[PDB]
Write a structure and sequence with these properties.
Largest sheet of chain B: 2 strands, antiparallel
Bound molecules: 2-acetamido-2-deoxy-beta-D-glucopyranose
Strand order of the largest sheet of chain B: 1-2
Chains: A alpha+beta, B mainly beta, D mainly beta
Oligomer: part of a larger assembly
Shape of chain D: rod-shaped
Protein name (chain D): Structural polyprotein
Largest interface: C-D, 58 and 71 residues
Radius of gyration of chain D: 35 Å
Protein name (chain A): Structural polyprotein
Distance between the termini of chain B: 57 Å
Structural class of chain D: mainly beta
Helix content of chain D: under 10%
Subcellular location (chain D): Host Golgi apparatus, Host trans-Golgi network; Host cell membrane; Host cytoplasm; Host endoplasmic reticulum
Subcellular location (chain A): Host Golgi apparatus, Host trans-Golgi network; Host cell membrane; Host cytoplasm; Host endoplasmic reticulum
Number of strands of chain D: 23
Strand order of the largest sheet of chain D: 9-15-12-13
Subunit structure (chain A): Oligomer. Interacts with spike glycoprotein E1. Interacts with spike glycoprotein E2.
Chain lengths: 60, 49, 342, 367, 49
């Protein structure tokens, strides 16, 4: 879908290299994600994936 | 300078303006008009087809 | 409304790092010297004296600009529109048009073509502003050439136009005593003051009894001038005078006239209709107004009507359905005082 | 759905004016006012997250407030918002506080603690609630009329608006450096401590263990925690992590604005009489309410004021009537009639004062 | 080009305009085709021939 770029690969903002729960596996790479991928609106869907309760930690 | 001039309304004529700033180095500058865009009132009245 | 935005500023302990001269609307930057960063465990940096602090500040749009904003418009020539109800022989029918001589409509054999707006005056100047329920005819500063603390404290063409001409002069200061913050200077705006003192909207400033109406804004109901209407009607309405009665020996008798705005007097028409029939009554002057228009008449008797004028004595003539009556009325001083209708 | 917790970041707070003159290290401080609702509801930034926790529940007994590298918690019944009057809190959601309250020189918020001792961040804050319409109020309204207006819509779905949330400067804690006979045992205690020492053999660097910094004292050591695990925000008024540019802040911030109407008070109808080419209007008051009037010709000549009391006001009327707008009621419209009487005809002339009714005293020079 | 839009580029400041001759090549009642405009009294609405 919408193309998020962590300066290396043109991945979807729905499919990061760490789908799901980025902070639950890496704090500071999630912070670099919060520095870089904020130019994409579909990153909010990643924020619905990583941040806004769609982790591995939910029993869904 | 605060050099306010009136250049003739001609596209593509190099106007050579003079800046003899007071007790300073003289400086001739070029200007060139490139478009004159005039856009009237956008008031659509009705149609016909 | 704008929004003043700062970064989290740079606490360069043990040295100085010069900022980057970026281009932001009212970009502002200063690296204060000898600063004192403080936190929960006393001072923040173990380095104390050579602590400098870069500070930056800028102003951009706010989040109220989606639906809450005023707009300096350039007004132009006005387009007219009119509403008309005709009681078409006991039948009310209504139609709207342009009141310019230029809007012909036809329905129920009524070729309604108006005449021109005899006036030409518009209640608006080009320099107009509008906010959300009202308009105001004042001269705003134009785009780019705005003034801080006024209209034009912040200027944008459209809400989607991101050219925000800003004028704040938010000059920073050294903080109080080791306080980890950035103070800035004075910057009054326009939204903070003139919305509270725009005052009398153009609804209230209207001459001749104009009224304003938004969505889209429009000047209604200052009926000034004189409007013509040409109306063509076929012979489906007119009936022969032999289908009418020839009214003879008419004599008008006014028991009480009073030159007033309302019902100016009452009259009795002694008439001799030859038969039964519906016929017209129309005074030969415009000043006195019979409230009765089309009367059914029966024979050789006295009909009773009213009339209305401000003539001190209404002496006039009425075509009673192709017959003539001359009428006379000593009118009296008006005893009424206030009237709600013109 | 329903999480904000992990985009937060642990840049701390010392409230620079928490009342009675001076400052204190307080995380619950006030930063921003949003007053742009037309009706007068108030939208307030705090450095806390309310309605939500560490583990993101809708409980009202815990709230993340930062007390010296600790996430502590507090009851949401102890929300003492007060400008001059104690405010009427309506909306408690994360970054945002919504309340309707009158005029005041200052504004403060009050909060309980994990030690259960309530305090207050108290800044001198001259918020002035605005005016709208023409009407004020004495009692509470349950019977009123219409006015269009705008207020903050209560929606969680306001995306692409942010505040600045960033990696911390540090958390310098001078309670971590215990001294062992002229040395320093930096008791890190499951943290990540950056030391800055003016001594030998260990000056500036990171540590995870209770490190031995010999020939060094408390004034010679530093213990600054590089926080990257527990994350709780502030405003960007406090400084940055000063090793690079900025950690970019990304949190969508809810509760936008939209247009509504309101049960505005009405305006009481006044009483009037006519008199000789003029009008005589007694006004029942209710409160200080504006009034306007105009005439219906080449100029309106509109005059405007606020009236306050039982006010008998006299206005002369032109030939074109008078338009007086009082309250947001009907704009009252009037037209003159020739007033009483001139005369009879009689033995004298006695039409001059007929003519002082009909075109009164105008074009009487000509005869 | 009307004397309202100031512009600075590499600190060089210019307010341009306004236009001296305000001549207009357009009528009020003008009709528009996909690439063109013509000065012609189109018949008014409801009152067309
Ligand atoms: C028709 O119109 C006249 C004035 O135009 C009005 O007085 C009357 O009440 C109307 N009657 C109906 C039935 O609409």
């Amino acid at each position: 879908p919408v193309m998020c770029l962590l300066a290396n690969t043109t991945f979807p903002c729905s499919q990061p290299p760490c789908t799901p729960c980025c902070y639950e596996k890496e704090p500071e790479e999630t912070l670099r994600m919060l520095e870089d991928n904020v130019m994409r609106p579909g990153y909010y869907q990643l924020l619905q994936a990583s941040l806004t309760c769609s982790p591995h930690r939910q029993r869904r | 300078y605060e050099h306010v001039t009136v250049i003739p309304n001609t596209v593509g004529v190099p106007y050579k303006t003079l800046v003899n700033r007071p007790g300073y180095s003289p400086m001739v500058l070029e200007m060139e008009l490139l478009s004159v865009t005039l856009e009237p009132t956008l008031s659509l009245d009705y149609i016909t087809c | 409304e704008y929004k003043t935005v700062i970064p989290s500023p740079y606490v360069k302990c043990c040295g100085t790092a010069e900022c980057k001269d970026k281009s932001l609307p009212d970009y502002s930057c200063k690296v204060f010297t000898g600063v004192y960063p403080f936190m929960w465990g006393g001072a923040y940096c173990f380095c104390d004296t050579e602590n400098t602090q870069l500070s930056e500040a800028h102003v951009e749009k706010s989040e109220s600009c989606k639906t809450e904003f005023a707009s300096a418009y350039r007004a132009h020539t006005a387009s007219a529109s009119a509403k008309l109800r005709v009681l078409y022989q006991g039948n009310n029918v209504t139609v709207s048009a342009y009141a310019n001589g230029d809007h012909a409509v036809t329905v129920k054999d009524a070729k309604f073509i108006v005449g021109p707006m005899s006036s030409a005056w518009t209640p608006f100047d080009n320099k107009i502003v509008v906010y959300k329920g009202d308009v105001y005819n004042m001269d705003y500063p134009p785009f780019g050439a705005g003034r801080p603390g006024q209209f034009g404290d912040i200027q944008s063409r459209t809400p989607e136009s991101e050219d925000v001409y800003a004028n704040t002069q938010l000059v920073l200061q050294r903080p109080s005593a080791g306080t980890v913050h950035v103070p800035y200077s004075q910057a009054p705006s326009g939204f903070k003051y003139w919305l509270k003192e725009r005052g009398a909207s153009l609804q209230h400033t209207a001459p001749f009894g104009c009224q304003i109406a938004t969505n889209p804004v429009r000047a209604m109901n200052c009926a000034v001038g004189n409007m013509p209407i040409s109306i063509d009607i076929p012979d489906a309405a007119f009936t022969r005078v032999v289908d009418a009665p020839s009214l003879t020996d008419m004599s008008c008798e006014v028991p009480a006239c009073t030159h007033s705005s309302d019902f100016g007097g009452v009259a009795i028409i002694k008439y001799a209709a030859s038969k039964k029939g519906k016929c017209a009554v129309h005074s030969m002057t415009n000043a006195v107004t019979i409230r009765e228009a089309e009367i059914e008449v029966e024979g050789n008797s006295q009909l009773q009507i009213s009339f209305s004028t401000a003539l001190a004595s209404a002496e006039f003539r009425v075509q009673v359905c192709s017959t003539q009556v001359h009428c006379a009325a000593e009118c009296h001083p008006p005893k009424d005082h206030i009237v709600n209708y013109p | 759905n329903f999480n904000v917790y992990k985009a937060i970041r642990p840049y701390l707070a010392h409230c620079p004016d928490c009342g009675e003159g001076h400052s204190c290290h307080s995380p619950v401080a006030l930063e921003r006012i949003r007053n742009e609702a037309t009706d007068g509801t108030l939208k307030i930034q705090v450095s806390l997250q309310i309605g939500i926790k560490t583990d993101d529940s809708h409980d009202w007994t815990k709230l993340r407030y930062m007390d010296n590298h600790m996430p502590a918690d507090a009851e949401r019944a102890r929300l003492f918002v007060r400008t001059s009057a104690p405010c009427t809190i309506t909306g408690t959601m994360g970054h945002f506080i919504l309340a309707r309250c009158p005029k005041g020189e200052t504004l403060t918020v009050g909060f309980t603690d994990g030690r259960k001792i309530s305090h207050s961040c108290t800044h001198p804050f001259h918020h002035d609630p605005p005016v709208i319409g023409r009407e004020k109020f004495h009692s509470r309204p349950q019977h009123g009329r219409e006015l269009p207006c705008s207020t903050y819509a209560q929606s969680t779905a306001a995306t692409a608006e942010e505040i600045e949330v960033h990696m911390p400067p540090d958390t310098p804690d001078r309670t971590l450096m215990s001294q062992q006979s002229g040395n320093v045992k930096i008791t890190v205690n499951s943290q990540t401590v950056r030391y800055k020492c003016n001594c030998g053999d260990s000056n500036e660097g990171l540590t995870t263990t209770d490190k031995v910094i010999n020939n060094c004292k408390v004034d010679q050591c530093h213990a600054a925690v590089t926080n990257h695990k527990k994350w709780q925000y502030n405003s960007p008024l406090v400084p940055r992590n000063a090793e690079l540019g900025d950690r970019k802040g990304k949190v969508h911030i809810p509760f936008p604005l939209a247009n509504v109407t309101c049960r505005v008070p009405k305006a009481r109808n006044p009483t009037v009489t006519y008199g000789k080419n003029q009008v005589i209007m007694l006004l029942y008051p209710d409160h200080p309410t504006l009034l306007s009037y105009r005439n219906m010709g080449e100029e309106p000549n509109y005059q405007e004021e606020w009236v306050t009391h039982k006010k008998e006001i006299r206005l002369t009327v032109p030939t074109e009537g008078l338009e007086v707008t009082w309250g947001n009621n009907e704009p009252y419209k009037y037209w003159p009639q020739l007033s009483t009487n001139g005369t009879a005809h009689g033995h004298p002339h006695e039409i001059i004062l007929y003519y002082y009714e009909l075109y009164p005293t105008m074009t009487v020079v000509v005869v």
